[PDB]
């Protein structure tokens, strides 16, 4: 399937899941698709209130306030060789690409890999300070 694909990028998949995300975060993620050594898609951009309420009931978030609800966050999924991976190092590499794109665009993007506790690789967001909501 992917033997003749000299540079593997999940552009179309990512663009679809970026619909409704804040245009400034979209711009950063689209640029990061160009830079990342690790192919990735966006697994979740906009999240519904009902899904957030479900997370709060189940305990995977403390609050109904989420940057995903308003368009200010994405979760990425690493797709090395077209196969989903949850391994940390892939997300570290993705974050290099995101950080470079972000910098080029003049926008700070926070990465869940730099959360003070319970670090997790998929999450990127625009800051509350820069992009209040
Ligand atoms: Cl930086
Ligand atoms: Zn997230």
Author numbering: 2 to 134
From the paper:
The asymmetric unit contains two ChiX molecules (labelled A and B), and the model for each consists of ChiX residues 2–134, with residue 1 (serine) originating from the genetic construct. ChiX presents an α/β-fold that consists of five α-helices, and four antiparallel β-strands are arranged as a single β-sheet in the order β1–β2–β4–β3. On the other side, and linking β1 and β2, α3 and a short α4 form a helical loop. This loop is orthogonal to the β-sheet, and together, they create an open and deep, mainly hydrophilic cleft. The Zn2+-binding site is at the base of this cleft and is primarily created by residues from one side of the β-sheet. The cation displays tetrahedral co-ordination geometry typical of many Zn2+-dependent enzymes involving two nitrogen and two oxygen atoms. Two histidines, His68 contributed from α4 and His123 from β4, co-ordinate the metal through NE2 and ND1, respectively. The third co-ordinating group is Asp75 OE1 and the fourth is provided by Glu7 OE2 from the N-terminal tail of another ChiX molecule (molecule B) in the asymmetric unit. However, while data presented in this study clearly demonstrate that ChiX Asp120 is critical for enzymatic activity, the structural alignment with Ply500 indicates that ChiX Asp120 is pushed away from the metal ion relative to the equivalent Asp130 in Ply500. Indeed, while the closest Asp to Zn2+ distance is 4.0 Å in Ply500, it extends to 7.3 Å in ChiX. This difference in conformation is potentially due to the salt bridge formed between Asp120 and Arg34 of the adjacent ChiX molecule in the asymmetric unit and further compounded by the presence of Glu7 also from the adjacent molecule, which forms the fourth co-ordination point with the Zn2+ and would prevent Asp120 moving closer due to electrostatic repulsion.
The high-resolution crystal structure of S. marcescens ChiX reveals that the protein belongs to the lysostaphin-type, d-Ala d-Ala metallopeptidases and sonic hedgehog ‘LAS’ family of Zn2+-dependent peptidases. In vitro assays then establish ChiX as an l-Ala d-Glu endopeptidase that cleaves the cross-links in bacterial peptidoglycan, and site-directed mutagenesis is used to demonstrate that the chitinase secretion controlled by ChiX is directly attributable to this catalytic activity. A mutant strain of S. marcescens devoid of ChiX was found to be impaired in the secretion of a select subset of ∼10 proteins, including all known chitinases and chitin-binding proteins. Available evidence suggests that ChiX relies on its partner protein, the holin ChiW, to gain access to the periplasm and that this is the only role of the membrane-bound ChiW in chitinase secretion.
